[PDB]
């Protein structure tokens, strides 16, 4: 099972306001028009690789998808991150858990913390073991694919936990669609509007027109011939 990322999964790269400007950052982003693996809650929660980092999304009824586990082998040999939502409340732990044969939220803890229309979106980065979580939530009309569109994900948390993650898994409301994409180090040109929200982006490695847009630091390109790169 697979679906297309489209232009989903850009996020604010740093804690800075910018406005009416185009800023070319390079960071771990979900590549434009890449595939994302597609799974179900019911009618399929195996461990997945984490690689350099994850984009995770869900189109769902309401709060069927509820959390995630991150670690190496999920079997108490080292610390392992757990993130949970119950009713209104976010809950987080990192203990050396031995997880169940099939973990669900049924209807040595070095860090712990608390705080048919739904698209959840998230990005998880673990550079130098610092677990950075970005997110967005939006209304949607149908719950069985990613929508073609754009909205930038904003920061929620930075966990300074230092863990060497290689795998992850989701947690869900057993007594409905979720999607996974992988980040890569890419130059993106980001359009910050008048109000300092990112409203559009160009993946500068997607196609030659996107190299041209990024060579010019511009989303409009006038007629011409542009020396965008040198190949070898």
């Amino acid at each position, epitope marked *: *099972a*697979y*679906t*297309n990322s*489209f232009t989903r999964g850009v996020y604010y790269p740093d804690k800075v306001f910018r406005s009416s400007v185009l800023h070319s950052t390079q960071d771990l982003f979900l590549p434009f028009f890449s*595939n994302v693996t*597609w799974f*179900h809650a019911i*009618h399929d929660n195996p461990v997945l690789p984490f690689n350099d980092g994850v984009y995770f999304a869900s189109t769902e*009824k309401s709060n069927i998808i509820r959390g995630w586990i991150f670690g190496t082998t999920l079997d108490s040999k080292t610390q392992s991150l757990l993130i949970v939502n119950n009713a209104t409340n976010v809950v987080i732990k990192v203990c050396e858990f031995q997880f169940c044969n099939d973990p669900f939220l049924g209807v040595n803890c070095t860090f712990e913390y608390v705080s*048919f229309k739904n698209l959840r979106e998230f990005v998880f980065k673990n550079i130098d073991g610092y677990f950075k979580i970005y997110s967005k939530h939006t209304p*949607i*009309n*149908l*719950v*069985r*694919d990613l*929508p*073609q*569109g754009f909205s930038a994900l904003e920061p929620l948390v930075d966990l300074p936990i230092g863990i060497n993650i290689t795998r992850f898994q989701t947690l869900l409301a057993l007594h*409905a*669609a979720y999607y996974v994409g992988y980040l890569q180090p890419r130059t993106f040109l980001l359009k910050y509007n008048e109000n300092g929200t990112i409203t559009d982006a160009v993946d500068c490695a997607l196609d030659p027109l996107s190299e041209t847009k990024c060579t010019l630091k511009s989303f409009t390109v006038e007629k011409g011939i542009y020396q965008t790169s040198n190949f070898r």
Partner: antibody, heavy 128, light 107 residues
Framework: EVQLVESGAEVKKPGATVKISCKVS????????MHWVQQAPGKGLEWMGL????????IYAEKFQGRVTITADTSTDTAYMELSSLRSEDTAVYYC?????????????????????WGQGTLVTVSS | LTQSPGTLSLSPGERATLSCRAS???????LAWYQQKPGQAPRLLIY???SRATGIPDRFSGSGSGTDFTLTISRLEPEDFAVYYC??????????FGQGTKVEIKR
């Protein structure tokens, strides 16, 4: 592989009501949205509405609003549609279809809406 | 949706080009093309404005830019005596068909 198997052809007066159905096979019936689509004789197609076969959530096209109704059942793997207070222009082919294969089984590897599969086309006649 | 021509034909082994057009009230990559031999139910040929359905011949091809979206049929065959429809979709749910083009081989 996948099969959508519709009702027989049907006949009614103007101001009456007709019912159409579609039994489904070869994929897990809940997992692909169910759709109804209409086609006047030799004409371009038009969409009538959709339902989720997992949950019964249904929405309708403007041109057939109030006249149409749709439902589906997971025990019989089957979809059903009604068209009500008929006119001669409702003489048409009618189709069940699906749109949202998570794997588009025997049709594509990475998916983007569109329609996955269609039934054989139920014929309807409306006349005095 | 606008679609043209109303009907099109040329010799076998040649090309036929169809266009589908609208205001941006419906979305660019959510565009697909369907073949119908008269009396059969329609069949998906192109999706993503440009990909092929599995097992459909490599001589069928879609492309588009901005407001204008196209099917080109190439190496024309007797199989191509069919009505071809675009459809286009958007975030606000509207599974919307084109006017349809009746394709033929020249005789």
């Amino acid at each position: 592989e996948v099969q959508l198997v519709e009702s027989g052809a049907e006949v009614k007066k103007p101001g009456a009501t007709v019912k159409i159905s579609c039994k489904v096979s070869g994929y897990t019936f809940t997992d692909y949205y169910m759709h109804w689509v209409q086609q006047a004789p030799g004409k371009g197609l038009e969409w009538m509405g959709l339902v989720d076969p997992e949950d019964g959530e249904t929405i309708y096209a403007e041109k057939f609003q109030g006249r149409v109704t749709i439902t589906a059942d997971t025990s019989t793997d089957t979809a059903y549609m009604e068209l009500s207070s008929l006119r001669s222009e409702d003489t048409a082919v009618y189709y069940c279809a699906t749109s949202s294969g998570p794997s588009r089984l025997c049709g594509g590897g990475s998916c983007y809406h569109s329609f996955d599969y269609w039934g054989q086309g139920t014929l309807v006649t409306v006349s005095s | 949706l606008t679609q043209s021509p109303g009907t099109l034909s040329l010799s076998p082994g040649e090309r036929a080009t169809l266009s589908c057009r609208a205001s941006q009230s419906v979305s660019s990559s959510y565009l697909a093309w369907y073949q119908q031999k008269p009396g059969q139910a329609p069949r998906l040929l192109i999706y993503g404005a440009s990909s092929r359905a599995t097992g459909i011949p490599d001589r069928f091809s879609g492309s588009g830019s901005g407001t204008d979206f196209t099917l080109t049929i190439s190496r024309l065959e007797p199989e191509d005596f069919a009505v071809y429809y675009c459809q286009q979709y958007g975030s606000s749910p509207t599974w919307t068909f084109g006017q349809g083009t009746k394709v033929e081989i020249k005789r």
